[PDB]
Design a protein around this ligand. Structure first.
Ligand code: HEM
Ligand code: HEM
Ligand code: HEM
Ligand code: HEM
Lengths: 146, 141, 141, 146
């Protein structure tokens, strides 16, 4: 992903402060609340009928953790997102049947969640760098679709 | 909003399609699956091979709903209420895909109705499919 | 369609923004220009350097218009009418760009209102901005 | 773009039958009628009040041919769209200020016009292959935007 070293160090530094056990849950939760149609993939997660039922759902929180762990791992290999996500891309296509547009929706929610937690420190330049990262991740998760 | 000229253009165009609607519906679906493979994620249960019967049959349902919409052009939200219900609470197709099907329908029409697909008619059918799309996603949230 | 709860959520959130609107609008625009540089094509005549006085002034105009939509949340198409004609006949910005600015407004609000930017509020504001964008885009053709 | 050799060949054979004068004029003119806001970039072409005027505008027609000429050059350079359209991308961004999103519009219109001309011969597989070209061209025209 075309990232300047000014972008990569800024991205990486912020990431250092992220509590993945919380942000992943917030991000998955907000996806399900703001874009309620994405709930079609998580029916086995139980009650998702109100914002509190979603945000506090423990299956949502646990799953958000896995998403972010895989995300973090992508930040460790920004020069090879495709390879890094190849098998996840195959799974989401062939087994889970998930429309890749949902990867872009999640990316944008993550950016909002980053904003919320970091405030002023989520500067416009820092945002611009994260937007490139989340589009790169979205593209890589979409690459094995056929 | 659809103008009187648009409604006229669309009833005209659709009138010729006539008994071929089911076939164009299936054709549109086939072109969408091949041109835009992500759309296949919404039909994991369908046999999507060329000329298969699920696509055939489903093509007919799509076309029929469109005929309903043409016949009720001045009154779409009402005529399409139940379909809109079904899309928002059960199918839950991401809004971007409506643009892709819409485009494939236009291509299908251009190719089968060369004399009827003038620029002004191309404009009205595009506005019409967008209006239908707006209606089917109107109750998503 | 906005629901009673949405309207309540938007009034509350915009109420806390208060007299910070202009400045949140200019921040939104700066965020948009940097993150989605294709949007700079609509502002070739503007100085877009950080702190630009033109960007600040324009941010205020955007925020004033949002404030008027919130003031007339039950009559938005009519409160925004003049703005909607301007967009359709003069400005002529591609609809996709509206999603890009809306997203940047939300980031700006989340970065400044930690306590009020709860999930339901975020949901409501995202709907509100989508409805504003639809109004401003409704007379394009 | 990832083209199959039978996709590379489906595209090439059909293009050899295209009347560039006619198809160019029609693609650009339809863009201006179907998506009226694109008229913002061509105020000096003249009268574009109605469809007949648009389609009859000699400058639209002449400009339509030029565009499809550049597009033809791209078909011969399919393994290097980026380098082929680099100067043009620069021009479209720095001199003309054209939102790249418009490239996608023209592309889709172009695809409809081909269908309009060739009927039965513009089969679904043939469309799929042109959809990749059109996307590849759009993405290459957008490459130097900053
Ligand atoms: C940043 C993008 C994403 C990443 C990195 C990611 C990663 C993962 C991982 C690691 C798993 C577990 C894989 C396994 O069970 O073997 C998973 C499962 C899943 N993902 Fe995602 N995912 C992403 C986005 C999405 C989104 C947007 C959706 C749909 C809205 C989605 C739908 C699912 C579903 C349904 C499962 C299986 C849930 C279950 O256990 O029942 N993913 N994802
Ligand atoms: C022009 C807009 C569309 C219309 C008018 C339309 C119409 C319909 C109709 C009439 C049905 C059958 C409903 C019933 O059982 O009574 C249906 C089902 C369905 N539609 Fe569409 N549709 C549209 C767009 C799309 C899009 C864009 C997609 C996704 C790419 C999609 C995917 C589906 C799916 C998955 C079903 C259920 C299929 C099944 O399992 O039987 N539709 N639609
Ligand atoms: C929430 C959506 C938006 C609102 C409420 C809004 C509001 C406004 C207002 C009040 C004006 C000043 C009009 C006047 O002269 O009275 C304006 C102008 C303008 N807007 Fe926006 N706008 C929106 C979205 C956009 C977006 C998406 C773009 C393109 C990226 C854009 C680009 C422009 C441009 C280029 C001008 C004219 C600048 C100049 O030359 O003075 N706007 N808008
Ligand atoms: C298929 C993608 C496109 C290609 C290959 C293309 C190609 C060209 C070419 C070859 C020129 C001539 C420039 C010169 O004289 O050196 C041109 C000019 C221009 N293009 Fe494009 N074009 C494309 C799409 C667009 C679209 C979608 C727009 C706006 C909707 C646009 C706006 C313009 C404008 C405003 C000019 C200058 C017109 C004038 O001379 O008055 N282009 N383009």
């Amino acid at each position: 992903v075309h990232l300047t070293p000014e972008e990569k160090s800024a991205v990486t530094a912020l990431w250092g402060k992220v509590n993945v056990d919380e942000v992943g849950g917030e991000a998955l939760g907000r996806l399900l609340v703001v874009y309620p149609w994405t709930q079609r993939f998580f029916e086995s997660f139980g009650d998702l009928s109100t914002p509190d039922a979603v945000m506090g759902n423990p299956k949502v929180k646990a799953h958000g953790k896995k998403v972010l762990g895989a995300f973090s791992d992508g930040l460790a290999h920004l020069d090879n997102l495709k390879g890094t996500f190849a098998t996840l891309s195959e799974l989401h296509c062939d087994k889970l049947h998930v429309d890749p547009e949902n990867f872009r929706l999640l990316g944008n929610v993550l950016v909002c969640v980053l904003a919320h937690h970091f405030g002023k420190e989520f500067t416009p330049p820092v945002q611009a760098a994260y937007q490139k990262v989340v589009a790169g991740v979205a593209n890589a998760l979409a690459h094995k679709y056929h | 909003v659809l103008s009187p000229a648009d409604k006229t253009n669309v009833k005209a165009a659709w009138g010729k399609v006539g008994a071929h609607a089911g076939e164009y519906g299936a054709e549109a679906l086939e072109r969408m699956f091949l041109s835009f493979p992500t759309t296949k994620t919404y039909f994991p249960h369908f046999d999507l091979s060329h000329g298969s019967a699920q696509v055939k049959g489903h093509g007919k349902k799509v076309a029929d709903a469109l005929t309903n919409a043409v016949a009720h052009v001045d009154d779409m939200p009402n005529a399409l209420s139940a379909l809109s219900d079904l899309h928002a609470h059960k199918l839950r197709v991401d809004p971007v895909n409506f643009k892709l099907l819409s485009h494939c329908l236009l291509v299908t029409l251009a190719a089968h109705l060369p004399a009827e697909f003038t620029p002004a008619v191309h404009a009205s059918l595009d506005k019409f499919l967008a209006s239908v799309s707006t209606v089917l996603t109107s109750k998503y949230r």
